[PDB]
Amino acid sequence: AFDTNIVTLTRFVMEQGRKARGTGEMTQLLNSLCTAVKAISTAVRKAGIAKLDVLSNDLVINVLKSSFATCVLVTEEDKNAIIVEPEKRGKYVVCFDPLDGSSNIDCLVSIGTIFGIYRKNSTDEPSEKDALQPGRNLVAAGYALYGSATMLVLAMVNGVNCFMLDPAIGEFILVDRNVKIKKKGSIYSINEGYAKEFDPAITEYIQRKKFPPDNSAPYGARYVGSMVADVHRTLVYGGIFMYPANKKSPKGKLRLLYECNPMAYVMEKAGGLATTGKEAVLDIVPTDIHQRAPIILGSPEDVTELLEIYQKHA
């Protein structure tokens, strides 16, 4: 044991970013983010022995500004975009959900940090307009799951890679390289306590998973109620995850910039699909930083089956 050739997230992003002639900024940005992720992981691991959304928020803003790689930051927590001080500005726009579903801590349900990184393209002064790009423009996106293990999943133009935090050295080690989702899965994930408010396409799809017409075995249902936990299971095991709109949350619950679009970019770089039920989530041009969206994502055939049922109903 004592491996002499550790592949850390920093080393990985460097061996790619160097083959691309990049300015070192991305490595710094993500190395910073990793420091915040280990700090939150440790706090969550001791939380009952020991508001954490708020402390997590502050920590992520402070390591991102000190990376000297960012210029506009968008949080769930902060009402308006944070524009970084000129001395510390670099060229990226980061949109992040710092501690997704923090009420789930009480029940020890695995929660996560979700992030999306854009490059600032304009010549003008950093404003929140720099944050209003469609998901399609993301240069990197991902999440950190704080579970039985801490996994950082990073998607960049070349594919999805998983890194697991080795607790003894405080480093994310590359554990799965260029991940791809199954074509067709066997689990559907949706909160069925909203049955009453679902649209017809949704309702027909669930019945087809439970009562397969085709008289195969019905799908298994799974719903942790933590988006990072449910998307991680959908990525490694396959299947479909659905948070559509239901009358009483008419534009969906999840936020387009820092929950839906990071997950949709990961899904797509893994060979999966992500849609509202009408358009692809990554093509939506955002008009508000806290804009909400329906999302259905997962294995290509499963999503395509629900898209055909949506087509049928309009």
Place this chain on the structure above:
Amino acid sequence: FDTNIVTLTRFVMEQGRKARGTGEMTQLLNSLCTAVKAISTAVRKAGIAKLDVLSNDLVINVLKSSFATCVLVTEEDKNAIIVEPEKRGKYVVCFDPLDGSSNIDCLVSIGTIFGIYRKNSTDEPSEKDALQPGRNLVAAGYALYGSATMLVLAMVNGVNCFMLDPAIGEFILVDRNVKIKKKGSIYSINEGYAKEFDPAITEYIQRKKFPPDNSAPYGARYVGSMVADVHRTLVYGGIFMYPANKKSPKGKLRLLYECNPMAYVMEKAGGLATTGKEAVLDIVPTDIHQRAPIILGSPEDVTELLEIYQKHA
């Protein structure tokens, strides 16, 4: 930096003192905690570089070494393990060393479940000493390997929750005399089995989604890991169900080391635990690996479901 920390060892030692006992339960839970920490560290790095097997070996070894056990029943072993005379003590332990190990690929929280009986007869230790009603467990609980490692322990005196402090390797008392909510707002079941359900489960699920008294509908959650789902049911209230579907008409979950521990914890917290026909804890087992249907959780929610079972007679 807190100087009078209550650890699981201090806690169990002071309760045992009141029994005017031998010290054997404290030796036992002390050893079990060593195994729990080692499985926790293993799951935390399961990826960097099967586990159910090592977990099984580890729990058996630390328990044989405690000088507190005489019969051991594992999910992994066809027959009960009888402890060597020189290491025998008075307890029978039935445990599931790493429930739903397949779940580790997806980072789903899993855990160790255990039930401890006292051997009461004078003849040689055997499987029959483990074939007691769950109502006769002297202690039970589970360790959850999740974003934090938690050990929940129920004994005659209540349910207490201990969190592993990873900096000093000790389980610290963080929650005392846990009691479940009387009525919750979450139902937990694998609805992919919908065609396989019976009339009462099906009518109950339906009235959760479409509430007759025009109430708020229940939220649904189903992690797919018994320890995670039951832990949320304990701290948040609600109902968790794994009834008989026709592919598992006795139920899926095993009575001695999955259903009975969890049911003993639920009833100690003021919750209820039923098959839909009898109390889980009052079933008299005939095979150490027999399965049972389970419905457990907040009292009003489980009663409601029991009233749909009997309004269906």
Place this chain on the structure above:
Amino acid sequence: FDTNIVTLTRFVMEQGRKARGTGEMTQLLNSLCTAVKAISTAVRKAGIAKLDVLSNDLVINVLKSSFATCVLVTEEDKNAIIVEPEKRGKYVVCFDPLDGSSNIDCLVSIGTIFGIYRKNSTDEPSEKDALQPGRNLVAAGYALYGSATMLVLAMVNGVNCFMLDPAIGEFILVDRNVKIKKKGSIYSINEGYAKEFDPAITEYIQRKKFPPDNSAPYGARYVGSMVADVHRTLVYGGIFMYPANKKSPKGKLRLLYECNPMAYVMEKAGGLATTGKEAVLDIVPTDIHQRAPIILGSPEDVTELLEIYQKHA
């Protein structure tokens, strides 16, 4: 991933079983290990963001809570602590909770030293029960907080060394029945006290540097922390000295909780421990904070120095 790990708790429990005892020594060293891990974590981050005090409070609390002690003697406390009747057990423990705490500024390895006696009288617990010859300790040792945390434990059966595995928070048996080398090649003393030495220490130091039989000279090492210097003397052999200099003419180090533990460990490993006039362990103490001169280490090296003390009469 090793499934039958020998922890200090398993080790002490199986030896105690042979005594047909009460289980009290195991309760005691189990609690002391909880305190040792917490002091270890504290020293490892002493810088990020006094400690002798918290260390002292922590050792007293875990010991009062073990139900195994009745008198406690600390470096930090003017008088012996008598344990409350409801928590009293049979042992007297004298300990130094964080020896040479000033050394932490320089990252010098420091440690906890302890000696355990059995209270033998029938009258109420008092300081007099701690005023026994070191020869009558039933167990002694130290925990070194260094690049690794090590607990060295000596009891009637030998010296064993246990290393803290920081991933599972358990002390693992890594070295069994440690015996010192008969003759070593390192002498350890604070030579800045050179004018204060006596004739025999001065002639001995001189013959280490300029060996009369034209031998190899000894290496000198002096960490300035009793636990580090004595630990190197145990694993590597040699001699360690803190004789009386005229500013400390009784010696500096305290008999009950620094000299006697270390001397009991040395004699159990086959080493010797002297003041230069008597065996340290046979001194009958009159004050719980009295000091003594100490010279301990490999048998041939300590004898040689004893022959320069008597060739000086």
Place this chain on the structure above:
Amino acid sequence: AFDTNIVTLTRFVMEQGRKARGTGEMTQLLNSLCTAVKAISTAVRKAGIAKLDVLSNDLVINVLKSSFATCVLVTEEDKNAIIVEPEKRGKYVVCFDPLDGSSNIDCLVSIGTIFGIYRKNSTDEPSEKDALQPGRNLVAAGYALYGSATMLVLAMVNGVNCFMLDPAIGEFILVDRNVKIKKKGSIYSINEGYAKEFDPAITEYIQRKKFPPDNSAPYGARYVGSMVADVHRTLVYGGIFMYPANKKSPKGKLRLLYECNPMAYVMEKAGGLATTGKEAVLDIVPTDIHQRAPIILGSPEDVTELLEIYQKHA
């Protein structure tokens, strides 16, 4: 607790290196080195539960080459300088002692990693000649002490800073900023088992510390027998550390490039002095990568007192 504004070694070197318009290479180099330091720290912390000089060596070479910041590496272990593959070359020369005094592990004596970093100045092809610069040219030097805590001490042109590894997050936190050694100390550190072979200046100096002519209190002696442990005590507490030549190790024992010169640069940036007894260690132009040297270092007045005794004797 849970501090939201953690100052890590990476953040520190970045906030300096950015004010200097540097290429990001130094941050990468030292971030790499920190990964190797945490890995060795953890191995040493479990060594008895569990050649490590050799494994440590390999790990340090592999993280340095992957930093894309180095071109020539010099180790105690390897006979000749390691020239890095063109794809991975950057501009620094690193000379390192990977696990100083590894025999001291058996006795749990604190040992360390020592490093010196030069910039390659030549226009020619990386060779070991790039490593043969006098200590005066070092752009950064330092050490990692694996003790009761792991401390990384880093000296750069601006001063000496201490960082302590926080074990829970795997990060070196800045704990002492712009450190300076005491002018005059009260401890002298030398292996006096060599008394017989010392030169007259040394011998006179030790007697003056034990039998102060001036009839003050004699100095205290301390000698751990681990250079990193003894230099760290000399830096924080003051005093003098001496490893001169004694007949049977006639050019000193310690190596000029990766033991003496990193320590001499730290001492001097802390306001201390480091000398052979004849010249300043940092002005010696090395001719062999494994060249040995006398070194006496510590508080300015203490070293100056021994230098005057050396002057007297020639």
